[PDB]
Design a protein around this nucleic acid. Sequence first.
RNA 1: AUAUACCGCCAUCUUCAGCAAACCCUGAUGAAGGCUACAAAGUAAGCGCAAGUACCCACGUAAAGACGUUAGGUCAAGGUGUAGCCC
Lengths: 132, 225, 103, 343
Amino acid sequence: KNRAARVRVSKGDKPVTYEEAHAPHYIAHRKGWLSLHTGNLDGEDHAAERTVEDVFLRKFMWGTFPGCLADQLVLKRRGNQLEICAVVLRQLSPHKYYFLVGYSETLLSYFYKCPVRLHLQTVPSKVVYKYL
Amino acid sequence: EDSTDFNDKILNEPLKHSDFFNVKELFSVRSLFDARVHLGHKAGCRHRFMEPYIFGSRLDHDIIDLEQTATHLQLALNFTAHMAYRKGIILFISRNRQFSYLIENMARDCGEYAHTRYFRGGMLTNARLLFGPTVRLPDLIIFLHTLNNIFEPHVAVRDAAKMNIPTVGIVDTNCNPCLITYPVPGNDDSPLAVHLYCRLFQTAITRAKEKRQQVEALYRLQGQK
Amino acid sequence: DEPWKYLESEEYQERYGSRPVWADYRRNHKGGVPPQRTRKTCIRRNKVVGNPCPICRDHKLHVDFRNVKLLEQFVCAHTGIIFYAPYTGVCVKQHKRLTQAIQ
Amino acid sequence: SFFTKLTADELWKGALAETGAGAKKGRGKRTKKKKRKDLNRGQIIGEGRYGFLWPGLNVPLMKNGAVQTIAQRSKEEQEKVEADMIQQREEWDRKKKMKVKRERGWSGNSWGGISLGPPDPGPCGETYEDFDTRILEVRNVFTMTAKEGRKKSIRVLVAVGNGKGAAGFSIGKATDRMDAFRKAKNRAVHHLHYIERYEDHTIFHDISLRFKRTHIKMKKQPKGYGLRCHRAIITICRLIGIKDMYAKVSGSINMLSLTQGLFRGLSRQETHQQLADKKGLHVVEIREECGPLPIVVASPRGPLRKDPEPEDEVPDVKLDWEDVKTAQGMKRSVWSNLKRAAT
RNA sequence: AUAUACCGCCAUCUUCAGCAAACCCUGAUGAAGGCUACAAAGUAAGCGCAAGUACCCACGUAAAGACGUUAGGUCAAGGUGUAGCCC
Ligand SMILES: [Mg+2]
Ligand SMILES: [Mg+2]
Ligand SMILES: [Zn+2]
């Protein structure tokens, strides 16, 4: 039985977002990629470096906003820009959110030598696409 | 202050009169006899609980006592008229495929509802699951045929007894009138008899609705002045 | 000094309410048929047994003949007899004291 | 390596072994077991070993009207903070460990008599806070299925009553005991009988009925007699609201048969008003405590009969040998009238 | 060291269509049972098949393929429980 990235139904009560609900064979069919960069195109280069950067960015953002993230990040790259679009729960006071945004933007910009922007969209609670 | 007079003068006004809607005018023993109401099945098919309503057997053919049928039909029509006057939901049920079209058409014309198709399991006992918890069950069910196509009692009778919904019913000599709230002994196979029942019930329901509208209008008009 | 005042106190109403003091008591014993006599005494040389009786488990309940409100709970309001010890779970010592107080 | 680390959820899923064949079968005993803990229960963002105070994150952004600067706590106060965090975690664990006991049923390891609270509220303003639920029996039925062989399931018989004469019972089958409880009580609340009670404390007349292979003999009793009945009957009577009654159960003591026979007998009993209406006569009660005073408990609502009921010198009734032997005193029993707890 | 503690990724039936909850009904409220289309107690939802999609079509091939079966395979992808090693 295939097990990759699938959320197996247990009782009909566990909530899953849109991305968690869909299985890998639905990528590019019912769900887009969580990272968009020209690395994997024909003839382009530095795919490995972009992949490592994306993995580190996801880990760093997950560990920097503990429990704040309501979904996976979206890492867009335009030129040397780097936009991290995130969906965050409305738990913390906005002061902490702004502090973390400034911190993460400056630290990532100095760590990857590229202008990193962080766009946060807040939701009252984790969006439930269905229950499993 | 509105309710204290509205409830009385509208709902409880007909309950004082024996025949508020004058349902006795609609039918007569001669009319029922002409509609072949008194005919029943053979003595072999007779159900014992229908013995009190059987006048006698005419060459192994039970005849339904139209004297008792008149009183039972009076009670049933009066009850149906009172329920319609109170805007209760009235559902006709008859699995007889011969009259399915006629019964559905009559129910649609009189503003009430019909169910002449395969009665799915739990359409009444499980109505909250099958329709949503806000569904409103019928306040009165009228069986024009209390037997299914395998000659067993219609499951809707037992279900309505379970849900405490009164049942008006046309019981033939082979039917079981135990759980039917208002049995009306009569022929249920003759097209004339079924047409007579449909006409009587449609007329009673329409008269009840019209009387309800008239009483509501009169009460609203007088209350304003 | 004034045992009847406890039964009128708010603490008594909190702990018990309208029910008698022995409503929630349940004896621990083996089998479905309890022994036909309760324990001799809950208080043994100033020490308290594991499951003290209704009287012994509340030191503010004073079995005194003037505390008629408490004594009414151990007399059947319909027949007038005094409940036997296993009925209320009271120990033999407190049951004898209750009988003497009621008399 | 940083890239080899995982999230807390994955680590808990892996370590706890909540899934897999071991959980399903349990062949490997797990008395020494691990339980899930929240590692982020009390962690504050911006707190660490170095004890730094980041303005706007873990310390107030503006202090005395001015923006705070990056400050680091001294070693002593940081040690105090760490010790306080440890103590707070210990206090949280201790509060988690503490709990409150409950009340046992008929016996310390039997589900019978244990209350389940009120039935679940209905969909539309249909609540049952007045009703109490009590378990009468729980059974582990094992069914042989083609693939799995012996499969365990729980069959639970519950009774629900409001204490004011309205009560019912139901059976619930499930895989889990709690699901069986929920099903059974939510179904019993739809199957409510109404048990007419004489003076709201006892039955109207002596009843003796056999259901299948279970004989129930109930005797109307005066106030204060209490409930001297089978423990299941005691529970059902408390749910109904009967305070004084006697009941002897003979034959099979099948709990379901006993319960539904009891409900049948209680439902089919005839009130004094019904008797007076049936026979058209005054129902006159004679009490020894009230002397020869005739007390009329029910009068026929229709016409009153003028002809006296025939007074046969010898009534034609089927007596019980147990009752006759008890009345004559020959019913010697080392188990009858034994002193028992209040019912 | 332990795949007979696990996550993760899969094999197998599967070249399957059923599964599991939540109810309802029958058997006197026993274990249990619940199908008839000119229909007679089953059912609104969930998962799977199906549908949709990829490839060249609507066909076909891929993909998908639930629950469950074999303590199936992997502690040597990595992570991890327990146990063990630290000149
Ligand atoms: Mg017929
Ligand atoms: Mg024990
Ligand atoms: Zn004591």
